[PDB]
Symmetry: D2
Amino acid sequence: SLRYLRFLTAGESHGKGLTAILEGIPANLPLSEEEINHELRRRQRGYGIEKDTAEILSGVRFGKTLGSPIALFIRNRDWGGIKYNQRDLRNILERASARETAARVAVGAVCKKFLSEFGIKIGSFVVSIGQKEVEELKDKSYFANPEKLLSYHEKAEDSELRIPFPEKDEEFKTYIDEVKEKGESLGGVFEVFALNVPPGLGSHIQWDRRIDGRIAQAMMSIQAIKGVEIGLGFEAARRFGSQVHDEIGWSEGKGYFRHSNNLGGTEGGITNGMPIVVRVAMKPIPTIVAVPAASVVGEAMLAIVLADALLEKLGGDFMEEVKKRFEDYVNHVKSF
Amino acid sequence: SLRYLRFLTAGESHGKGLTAILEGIPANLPLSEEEINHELRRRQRGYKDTAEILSGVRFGKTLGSPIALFIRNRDWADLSGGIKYNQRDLRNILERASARETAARVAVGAVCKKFLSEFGIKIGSFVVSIGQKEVEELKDKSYFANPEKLLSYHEKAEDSELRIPFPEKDEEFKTYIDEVKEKGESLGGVFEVFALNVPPGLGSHIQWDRRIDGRIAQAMMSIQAIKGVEIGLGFEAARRFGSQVHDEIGWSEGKGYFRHSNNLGGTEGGITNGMPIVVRVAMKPIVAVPAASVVGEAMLAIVLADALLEKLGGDFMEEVKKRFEDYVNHVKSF
Amino acid sequence: SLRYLRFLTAGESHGKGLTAILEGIPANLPLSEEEINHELRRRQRGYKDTAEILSGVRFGKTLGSPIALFIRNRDWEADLSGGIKYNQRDLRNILERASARETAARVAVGAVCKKFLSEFGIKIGSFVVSIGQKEVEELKDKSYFANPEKLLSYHEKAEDSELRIPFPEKDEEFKTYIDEVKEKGESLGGVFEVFALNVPPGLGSHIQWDRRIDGRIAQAMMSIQAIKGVEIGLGFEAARRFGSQVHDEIGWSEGKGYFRHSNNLGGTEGGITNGMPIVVRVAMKPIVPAASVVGEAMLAIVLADALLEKLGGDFMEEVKKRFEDYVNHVKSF
Amino acid sequence: SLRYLRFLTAGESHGKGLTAILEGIPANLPLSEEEINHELRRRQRGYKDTAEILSGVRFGKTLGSPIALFIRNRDWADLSGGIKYNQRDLRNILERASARETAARVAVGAVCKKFLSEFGIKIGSFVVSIGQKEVEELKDKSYFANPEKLLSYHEKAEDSELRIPFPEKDEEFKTYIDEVKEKGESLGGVFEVFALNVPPGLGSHIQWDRRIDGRIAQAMMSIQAIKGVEIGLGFEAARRFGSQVHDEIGWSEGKGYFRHSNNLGGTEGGITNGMPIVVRVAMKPIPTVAVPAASVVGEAMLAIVLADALLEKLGGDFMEEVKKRFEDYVNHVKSF
């Protein structure tokens, strides 16, 4: 459950389409269908007219948000059972199917646009598919390196499997087919990150306000996701406090920061100022690798949580107002 | 957050005490302070604490009104929180962020456990690793589908000083801990929490925030020092073939639907499937993992009590239990 | 807000159309676009509108998933406070969403809740009680608040009235008066009453301020554009009379259980419904028949929410069975 | 209900006492038990209650954490509730339903009032009628647009044993009441609660549940015995012509944009307009004169709603932060 933003999605996999209504994004935010469609396209190319497109039904005029609810519709074009008493599990799968994640990505696309206005960037990349892992990423020191993270995301965009090293593509494509010929499905793991998130988002005062918990629900709620780690995660539970602890640093023109990021950008339920890093595990599908698409949905979920948490801290009804409060707050952080 | 129950905790680590208010538990539920104190003691034992019921209970039974609890303090997030709340006197945040707050959580959880027991639902847990030392016997997770095994591990854990399923290894672990403590070092750990006899159908796939897996993930990860959470096999499942993770569906007269394995941890597509709910939680170093496991039980009880009430609704046990029976028969007879 | 149901509406007055998403209605509830349009039309006559079901319904029945509706604004070919609030220099951006046109989406959502409610024998209706200084005299005495037959009858006649007044015969007196005031540079507001029949006792709760059914109905009604006043039962009049005068004496009978001899309380006691007709009086300031139709929708939403809150359930059969078990429990208490 | 603040109250009429937890009040707000007790006393005189702060306050200031309050119970409807919760002993319902619960609401309301005072927002009320007897001088509601008059009526009311704006009429009302008492009768009443210096922009028109009027209506109508609520003129406005109801808009250099009258009650289109917020509340006869006490609870409820709406608009975790945003916003208002 979000604290500031509100949204609902609807639609069955084989129905007229998917509908979503997002409320809470401030007024005067430049927003276009192309920005939304771009994200929908990344998710589509993650499974391996046909292109998903969203039509804005309200909330936007002359390229800017009005401040009113934003409604989107995604045509399908190709146009549980016990709990709801549905003998035909089709009615259950229709709505359950990962088809619904497309609406999540559309809502997330709006949140990403909102976040970018504050210089906040979200990205991701696959680190393992089946038993084959991206060995270059076993050392997690890059969790504290914005340039590297961004670098890996950029390369993932040039990968048919969204892996940080496209050259490895052919190699991975081999292992995959080598497995799909044995009538076997594959799972995977990806990492999602957010850069330039100021310290102070989320809160330690109540269990449900902790940023980590919120991130956890958003990620684990994605279909097929069975595991989630913030930063080092389970590996951190096997190490010594000293080999996990992120050393605190400070500078005159920068304020406080950390020398490493094993915590994944959060400390005691609140963001660190360091990159937010989340590791997500997707179990093998059914029985067309889906981990790449999953990672794109992961970015959408993280953008929703962060946009929500940022608005919770800043408040505001129009961009000029929110941006001013962000600037004052960041100034307060730097000089603390 | 929750979908049916509502609660809030308050109090600083070194203040007068911890306060908690829980709303939504049906009326006529036998409840006593000992049942609460029992859980509070298990928490401290994992590293004197009692709770006084201030309202919501009369003649040993809930009135259906809000239940207020107070845990008197006998001895009467840092930095980021300091920046966040403009608190120069850092102790102002550390005070509320302290794991002492988890005591109020366990207090609330205790009431939820009692509620759940009325339906035969049992919650338990045990530590599987501390630092680099793991309980090798528990390496194979086949026991995720075995209610008897899970329960026995919990029971034995209650006799372990570190809540490990094999008390005879306490010295082997204690030596390791004392050893790491010899140096200037702290340790984290990993525990598994489970719920038995939970009916399929809890939670929902209709909306991302209603899926039971996300709700379990938030509750668990909201616990102090927790940095990782898995439902069932977890990250391990992500590395296997589809056929090695799949929990084949089985059915028999009377027993109804069930699964031959539980790599999924008791949930499928955002809803409980009838199998034991199993959650793996990773705690980073700050020893404290045993107390964390107890807190994990409380969080799981709260999420499940909430999910059960969301499905059944009702204002008094008699009413809620009748609905449970009809639903269960509906499940089997499906 | 709501305790079980969840919904959101969107759309600008002159945009492409109105959108709404409703979540929480049980599966297997018969639902058609015609049942929705029926209400949408009643709303317009209060001053075409057609709703397309985009999801949640298959083979005429609800799937249990979210129900999305779209009301296409076919001719697609206040202000200051919102302008300041949202930094909207062009106040049209505030007007487009604030417009009473938005109420159509609320009526569409309400229509679904009405159908859900009807599956339980619960009926929702309304009628106009006054417009300007002209009030319906025959209804001065509020004794009919405890008479389901009368309330239902007044609603029926209203359905034949151009201004939804409970006495079609008075249509001309009202229309004439309206034209007179309209002949001048003036506009009128009005009062209407909304009721719900066959609602069981126990809906809502007294344990927490935000769960009391009276506060929930009040927000729903007052949220309607131009509504400045709301009362449950006698309302402000009850505040003027003596205790013994407003008090609804409790009655009981073998084959009917507990009930009340009068309904000055409007079907609510201490935060809970008491079994009597739920009656709400609503005041709309100048610039009412259409508003009364919106009032029905809002009361349907709140009651459907309160019903599901008490019963739970994911499919009609399940809910209806818990209903019967609950009602029997009430009678034999 | 609320969108920013969160709180819960608990306790039975004759139990050990009343408990409450309020979350969301910013850090560094001066707060003492006497500020709370003062409000608790006003309530008692409306028919020594004292609250004990158990957390959320250190050195006279809020820490930013949840605020817990306990109100001792020294002495340490029913049917519908008895049926709903299957309680054969109707004393189990009366104990919680009892207007005794309002004491907890007033304690919560006190903290909110203090918060609101930091911004110059003032909340008050006064009784306008008891039984068939109403304060004639208040028949004309033109004083809704007069901050000074309203405040005056409230101060005068504080000198009345029936919180009526005209203390001289006390004996007059006392007798009338006494006469009604003789023939074994109970009386209801009508009071008006106002809020001064509230800026335009609180609440929203974008979604039904965000509109300020609706939020005020639930808060008020949720008070025991309340059967009616009006914002401004109310039902009387429904009986008037548009021109004799609408508040014409005026503009000036200072405090730009204002209204010439306040028939609307300080809200329009679901948003506060800067004018005084005025609510008229009707309380039925209890059971088969508590209207003065009811007015004090009405104040607490309006304060909670407004503090929540103000926080919703401003956001913020500490007072210095919230105050600058308020200043900036008001600056935006005056120059719009």
